Ligand binder design. Structure first.
Ligand SMILES: [Zn+2]
Ligand SMILES: [Zn+2]
Length: 229
């Protein structure tokens, strides 16, 4: 069951995987939830995405201390919007090594974000260049192409049935794709489908702005994105 911890919500998804959820008022849009992940890999913890703010991100680290009590080895963030990168300073203050797509780090200052310490680069086929993602353990990072943003990346968790689409993917009952302000409308559908094809065995799809769903999230997202073209 969901665990309320201050103003955040935590939900266990698998033996070594939890979803973190944080909220920000977007005047004219309500209090918007954003989800990320926490993964235990043996004696360390790996984080996918910050919360919206530094204070919320420090609360994620407090939850980790209380519920797991192992060091956070690294964090990876999935694009340069506030829901994913807004808490970078809290990670740095905590001594955590941080990673983002090189393009996300380039875009960070103009988006009002602090860049991660390290830049991921990607092969032509979308898989991360392994030397840029050292010690990522079960995290398999994939650039699916431009969609929600030009820089969006995705993460599979090896040894689980879980893949994280970030803000690229919405659930199977969603009426829209959400914030398309920085989207690549021409390529979105193909990028959504490429995410699915990269993680074919993932039966639980986690995403930023919907609760976890089946792979119908991917097909429905792509079918909605077909209409942008
Ligand atoms: Zn975004
Ligand atoms: Zn988002």
């Amino acid at each position: 069951g969901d665990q309320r911890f201050g103003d955040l919500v935590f939900r266990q998804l698998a033996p070594n995987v939890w979803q973190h959820t944080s909220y920000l008022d977007m005047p004219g849009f309500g209090a918007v939830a954003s989800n990320g992940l926490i993964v235990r890999d043996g004696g360390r913890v790996l984080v996918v995405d910050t919360a919206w703010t530094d204070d919320q991100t420090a609360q994620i680290l407090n939850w980790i201390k209380q519920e797991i009590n192992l060091p956070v080895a690294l964090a990876v963030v999935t694009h340069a919007h506030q829901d994913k990168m807004g808490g970078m300073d809290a990670l740095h203050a905590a001594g955590i090594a941080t990673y983002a797509n090189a393009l996300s780090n380039q875009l960070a200052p103009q988006e009002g974000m602090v860049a991660a310490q390290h830049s991921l680069t990607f092969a032509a086929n979308g898989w991360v260049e392994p030397a840029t993602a050292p010690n990522f353990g079960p995290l398999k990072v994939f650039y699916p192409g431009p969609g929600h943003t030009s820089d969006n990346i995705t993460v599979g968790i090896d040894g689980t049935d879980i893949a994280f689409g970030g803000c690229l993917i919405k659930d199977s009952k969603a009426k829209s794709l959400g914030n398309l302000g920085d989207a690549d409308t021409e390529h979105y559908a193909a990028s959504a489908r490429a995410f699915g094809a990269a993680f074919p065995k993932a039966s639980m799809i986690v995403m930023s702005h919907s609760a976890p769903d089946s792979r119908a999230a991917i097909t429905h997202t792509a079918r909605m994105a077909d209409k942008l073209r």
